[PDB]
Amino acid sequence: NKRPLKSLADMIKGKQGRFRQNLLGKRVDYSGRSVITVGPYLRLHQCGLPKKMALELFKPFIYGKLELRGLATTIKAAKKMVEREEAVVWDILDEVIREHPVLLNRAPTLHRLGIQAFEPVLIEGKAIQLHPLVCAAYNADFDGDQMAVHVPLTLEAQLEARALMMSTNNILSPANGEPIIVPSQDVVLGLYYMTRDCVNAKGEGMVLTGPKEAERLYRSGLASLHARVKVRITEYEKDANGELVAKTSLKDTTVGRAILWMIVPKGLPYSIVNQALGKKAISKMLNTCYRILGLKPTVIFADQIMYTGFAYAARSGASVGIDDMVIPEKKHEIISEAEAEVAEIQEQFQSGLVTAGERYNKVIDIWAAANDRVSKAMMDNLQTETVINRDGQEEKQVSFNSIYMMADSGARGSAAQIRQLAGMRGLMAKPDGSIIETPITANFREGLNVLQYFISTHGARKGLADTALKTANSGYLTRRLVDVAQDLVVTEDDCGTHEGIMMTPVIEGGDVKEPLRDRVLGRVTAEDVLKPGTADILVPRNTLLHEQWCDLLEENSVDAVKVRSVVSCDTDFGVCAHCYGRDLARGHIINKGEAIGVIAAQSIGEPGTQLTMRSSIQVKNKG
C-alpha cells in the first residue's frame, strides 16, 4: 500500500505508540456504552442503567451470588443461566446493584468531573439515564451523546467511588468554588416563571397562612401561580452558636415564590427566593446553601428544586412561536435612516471629500449605531411593550413573553443570540475577518436574502472551522498542562513560611474586574491583615479565608492582603496544604495528599474549547 511500515520506534512514540495507547490510557473490561437519557425522576446520587448492561457488566458478581445461594453449582451452569436471563437471575442482579457504584464516563473527559460515580437504577430500555443536574458538569447533551460506564470491582474501588466520585460529593467544580450541579436550562426556566408577578393576576391581594396555603390555592386553580400576595413564613436562621432560630413575619411576595419556600432547607433566608431567580440567582442560592447548611441538605435541596422547576416548567407551557418574537416598529425607520446615511456617505465619497478608508470607517460606524438602535428598540418592544392593568387604568410591567423569559432568566440564550432573532443580525465578517460593508439587515423571524445567507454561512463556516481547530489546540494544551504537572501533590500540612504574594484586586484601567473577596477566598494568608487601625490583627497569620472571613474583609474595607502562594512554598517534591488553600470542591482545607497538579491542569484546559482565536485620564467616581 506504499506506506511507511511501522518500526521499533514508531511503536514507542506518537499517539498510537505503546506509551499513550496502552500504558497512559488503556481499554478496560466491565465497560459499556449507550446513548444517554434524561430521566428526571432520578436523584443525582443515582443514574438509570439498562437491564442488559447491568447483566453483562456484573456477570462475575451474578455468578458469585448464584454460587453462594446454590442456584447453580458451577460457574458453567451459572453462565448458561445468565444467557437464559431466567427470572431468578434478575432478582440476583438487583442484589448486586443495591450499593455498587458505577463510573459514568463521557468520552471527552476535559476535567475532573467528567467521570462521576452513580448508584445504578435498573431500567428497562437500552439507554443510560443521566441525572439532569450533572449534565452541565459532564457538558453532556441528549443529542446522541454516549458515555461509557465502568464498574468498580474491589471494595476499595467501590468505596472510594462512593466517597469521592459520587455526584453528591461533587457539587463545587475544582476550577472554582461556584456550584457545578446548578439548575442549568429547563428547571431554571421553570423557577424563573415561578418567581415572577403580574401586576393584576388571579387571586392577588389576600393574605396566605403559609407556603402550604399557596400550594393549595395554586393547585385548586383559584389563584394564579405568580400573584403578589402577603404570606406568613417561618424563616429559620442559625445566627446562634449553631442553633436555628425561627422568625415569623408577613413578607410581601408572590404565590410562586411562596411555593419554593417549602423546598428550601430551614437555614436559608427568604431574601434569596424573593427575586426573579434567574440562573445567577439560583447559582448564588446553591452556593449559599452549600456554605451554610453543608452537603447533604444541599443535595436534598438541589433534588427538590430540580423536581419543582421541572414540574412547574411543564405547568408553565413556556412555548416558542412567531408572535413570541416581536419586530420593533422603529426598525423600518432605523433601516431607512441607515440607508440614507450610507447614501450620503457614498455621495460624499463620489465627489472626493472622503476617500475609501474614511468612507469605510464611517459606514461601519453608522451601521453599528443603527444596529445598537434597533437592538434597543427590540429590547423595549420585548420587555416594555407589555400593557396590563391593576384593576385600575393603566400600568406597565416586565414582559412575560416566551423568548424574553427564556433569555433574561439565563436559561438559554444571550444578548447577541436574541438580537439575531428579532433585531438586525448585524454586520457579518468575511473569512479573512474584515467586515462586510453592508450588514445582514434582515432577521431570522423574517426571511434572509441569498447574499445575506451567504454572509451568514461565511461566518458559520468560519466559526465551525475555528471550533474544530480550537478543540485540538485545547486538547494539546491540556496534555501539556497535565504533564508539566502530575508530580505535584499536597505532601505536607504546613511549612511555616512567611513568604507569599500580596493579593490585590486587579484593575486594567476600568472598574474592578475581580474584587478581593472573590480573589483571596479559600487561601491562607501569610501575614496578619490589618484594618485602617494599625497593629490590628483583623485576620491572624495562618487562618483559611472562608466566606465569613471574606465578608468581614469587605466591611472592614481592606485593600491588599498578603496570602501564602503555592509558588512561595518551600516544600520539596510537593507543596503543603496551607500554601495551597481550599480544595475549591469541598468547604475545607485541601486534604494532605490530594493531587492538585492534575486538578489545576484540567481546570485550566477545560475552558480551552470556550476561548477564541482572533490622550487624557478621567476620574470615574468620587474619591
Partner 1 sequence: VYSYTEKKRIRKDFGKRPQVLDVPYLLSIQLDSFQKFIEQDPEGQYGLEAAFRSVFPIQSYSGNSELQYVSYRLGEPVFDVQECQIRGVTYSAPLRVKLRLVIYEREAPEGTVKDIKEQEVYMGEIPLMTDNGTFVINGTERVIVSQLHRSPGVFFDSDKGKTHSSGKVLYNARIIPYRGSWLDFEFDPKDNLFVRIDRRRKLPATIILRALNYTTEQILDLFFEKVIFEIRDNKLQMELVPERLRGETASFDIEANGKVYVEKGRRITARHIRQLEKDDVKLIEVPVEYIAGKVVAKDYIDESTGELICAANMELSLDLLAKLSQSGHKRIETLFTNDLDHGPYISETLRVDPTNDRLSALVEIYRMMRPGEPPTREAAESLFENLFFSEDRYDLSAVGRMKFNRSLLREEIEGSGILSKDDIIDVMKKLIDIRNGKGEVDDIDHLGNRRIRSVGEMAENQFRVGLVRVERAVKERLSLGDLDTLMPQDMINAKPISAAVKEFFGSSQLSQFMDQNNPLSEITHKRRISALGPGGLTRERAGFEVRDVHPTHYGRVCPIETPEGPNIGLINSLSVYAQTNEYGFLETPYRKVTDGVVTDEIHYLSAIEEGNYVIAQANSNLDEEGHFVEDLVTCRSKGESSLFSRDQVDYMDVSTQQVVSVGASLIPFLEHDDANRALMGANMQRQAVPTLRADKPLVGTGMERAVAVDSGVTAVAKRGGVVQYVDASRIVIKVNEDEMYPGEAGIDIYNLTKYTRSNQNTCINQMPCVSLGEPVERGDVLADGPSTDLGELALGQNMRVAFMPWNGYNFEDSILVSERVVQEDRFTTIHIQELACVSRDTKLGPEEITADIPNVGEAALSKLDESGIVYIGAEVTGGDILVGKVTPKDSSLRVPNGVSGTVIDVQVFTRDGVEKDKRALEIEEMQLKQAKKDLSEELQILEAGLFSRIRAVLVAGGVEAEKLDKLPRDRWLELGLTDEEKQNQLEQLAEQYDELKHEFEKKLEAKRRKITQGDDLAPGVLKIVKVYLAVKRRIQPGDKMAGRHGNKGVISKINPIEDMPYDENGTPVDIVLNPLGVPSRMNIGQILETHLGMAAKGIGDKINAMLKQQQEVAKLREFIQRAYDLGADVRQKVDLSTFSDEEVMRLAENLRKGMPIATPVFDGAKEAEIKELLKLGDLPTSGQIRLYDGRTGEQFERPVTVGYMYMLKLNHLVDDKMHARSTGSYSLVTQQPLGGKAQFGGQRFGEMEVWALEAYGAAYTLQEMLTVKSDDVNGRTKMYKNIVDGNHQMEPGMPESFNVLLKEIRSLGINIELED
Partner DNA sequence: CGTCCGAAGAGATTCAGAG
Partner DNA sequence: CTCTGAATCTCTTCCTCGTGTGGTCAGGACG
Partner RNA sequence: GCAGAGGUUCUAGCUACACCCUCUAUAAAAAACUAAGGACCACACGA
Residues 54-93 that bind RNA (CB under 7 A): 73-77, 80
Q: Which run of H or E residues covers position 6?
A: none
DSSP one-letter string for 288-355: HHHHHT-SHHHHHHHHHHHHHHHHHHHHHT----TTTS---TTHHHHHHHHHHHHHHHHHHHHHTSS-
Binding string to partner 1 for residues 154 to 173, with x set by CB under 8 A, is what? xxxxx-xx--xx--------
From candidates 108, 431, 593, 607, binder to RNA by CB under 7 A: 108
Nearest to 569 by CA among 489, 484, 503, 486: 489
CB of 421 to DNA, least distance (A): 29
Separation of alpha carbons 270 and 250, rounded Å: 11
Question: Is 495 labelled a binding residue?
Answer: yes
Separation of alpha carbons 230 and 217, rounded Å: 13
The verdict on 437 binding partner 1 (CB under 8 A) reads yes
Separation of alpha carbons 371 and 339, rounded Å: 12
Question: Is 47 labelled a binding residue?
Answer: no
- Phi/psi at 457 (nearest 5 deg)? -75, -25
For residues 139 and 35, the answer to whether their CB atoms sit within 8 Å is no
- Write out the binding residues for partner 1, residues 575-594 only, by CB under 8 A: 591, 593-594
Among Mg ion, RNA, DNA, none, what does residue 74 contact (CB within 5–8 Å per kind)? RNA
The verdict on 620 binding DNA (CB under 7 A) reads no
CB of 70 to RNA, least distance (A): 12
Separation of alpha carbons 5 and 135, rounded Å: 43
Q: What is the grid cell recorded at 146?
A: 454516549
Candidate segments 14-22, 200-208, 282-290, 498-506, binder of DNA by CB under 7 A: 14-22
- Name the residue nearer to RNA (CB basis): 140 or 233: 140
Q: Helix, strand, or coil here: 446?
A: coil
From candidates 178, 386, 400, 546, binder to partner 1 by CB under 8 A: 400
From candidates 143, 239, 323, 391, binder to Mg ion by CB under 5 A: 143
- Write out the binding residues for DNA, residues 140-169 only, by CB under 7 A: 146, 148
The verdict on 607 binding DNA (CB under 7 A) reads no
For the purposes of burial, counting CB atoms within 10 Å of the CB of 58, is it exposed (0-12), middle (13-18) or buried (19 or more)? buried
Question: Residues preceding discontinuities in the chain at C–N > 2.5 Å?
Answer: 614
For residues 80 and 96, the answer to whether their CB atoms sit within 8 Å is no
Q: How far is CA 545 from the centre of its chain?
A: 24
For residues 290 and 587, the answer to whether their CB atoms sit within 8 Å is yes
The verdict on 132 binding partner 1 (CB under 8 A) reads yes
Among DNA, RNA, partner 1, none, what does residue 6 contact (CB within 5–8 Å per kind)? RNA
- Phi/psi at 36 (nearest 5 deg)? -110, 155
Question: Is 141 labelled a binding residue?
Answer: yes
From candidates 46, 167, 184, 195, binder to partner 1 by CB under 8 A: 184
Query: How is residue 617 annotated by DSSP?
Result: -
The verdict on 33 binding DNA (CB under 7 A) reads yes
Binding string to DNA for residues 453 to 492, with x set by CB under 7 A, is what? ---------------x--xx-xxx--x-------------
Question: Is 198 labelled a binding residue?
Answer: no
Candidate segments 141-149, 362-370, 506-514, 569-577, binder of RNA by CB under 7 A: 141-149
The verdict on 141 binding Mg ion (CB under 5 A) reads yes
From candidates 143, 323, 394, 555, binder to RNA by CB under 7 A: 143
CB of 594 to RNA, least distance (A): 29
Q: Which residues lie closer than 8 Å to 89 by C-beta, 6 or more apart?
A: 55, 62, 66, 81, 82
Candidate segments 61-69, 508-516, 537-545, 552-560, binder of partner 1 by CB under 8 A: 61-69
The verdict on 14 binding DNA (CB under 7 A) reads yes
Q: How far is CA 208 from the centre of its chain?
A: 35
The verdict on 258 binding partner 1 (CB under 8 A) reads no
Please report where in the chains the cell 512514540 appears, as a residue. 13
CB of 520 to DNA, least distance (A): 33
- Name the residue nearer to partner 1 (CB basis): 94 or 559: 94
CB of 44 to partner 1, least distance (A): 13
Bridge partner list, 512:
507
Among Mg ion, partner 1, DNA, none, what does residue 13 contact (CB within 5–8 Å per kind)? DNA
Candidate segments 7-15, 169-177, 202-210, 612-620, binder of DNA by CB under 7 A: 7-15
For residues 85 and 55, the answer to whether their CB atoms sit within 8 Å is yes
The verdict on 16 binding RNA (CB under 7 A) reads yes
Q: Which residues lie closer than 8 Å to 497 by C-beta, 6 or more apart?
A: 526, 564, 568, 569, 570, 579
- Phi/psi at 617 (nearest 5 deg)? -115, 125
Candidate segments 64-72, 285-293, 502-510, 521-529, binder of partner 1 by CB under 8 A: 64-72
The verdict on 141 binding RNA (CB under 7 A) reads yes
Q: Tell me the number of residues near DNA by CB under 7 A.
A: 20
CB of 478 to RNA, least distance (A): 15
The verdict on 455 binding partner 1 (CB under 8 A) reads yes
Question: Is 576 labelled a binding residue?
Answer: yes
From candidates 4, 70, 242, 321, binder to partner 1 by CB under 8 A: 321
DSSP one-letter string for 224-257: -SSBEEEEEEEEEE-TTTSPPEEEEEEEEEEHHH
From candidates 15, 98, 614, 622, binder to DNA by CB under 7 A: 15
Candidate segments 13-21, 45-53, 241-249, 384-392, binder of DNA by CB under 7 A: 13-21
- Report the b/e string of 373-392 with b at 16+ CB within 10 A: bbbebbbebbbeebeeeeee
Residues comprising the binding site? 141, 143, 145, 495, 569, 576, 579
Which residues are near RNA by CB under 7 A?
A: 1, 3, 6, 16, 73-77, 80, 107-108, 141, 143-146
State the binding site for Mg(2+).
141, 143, 145
The annotation places the binding site for Zn(2+) at 495, 569, 576, 579
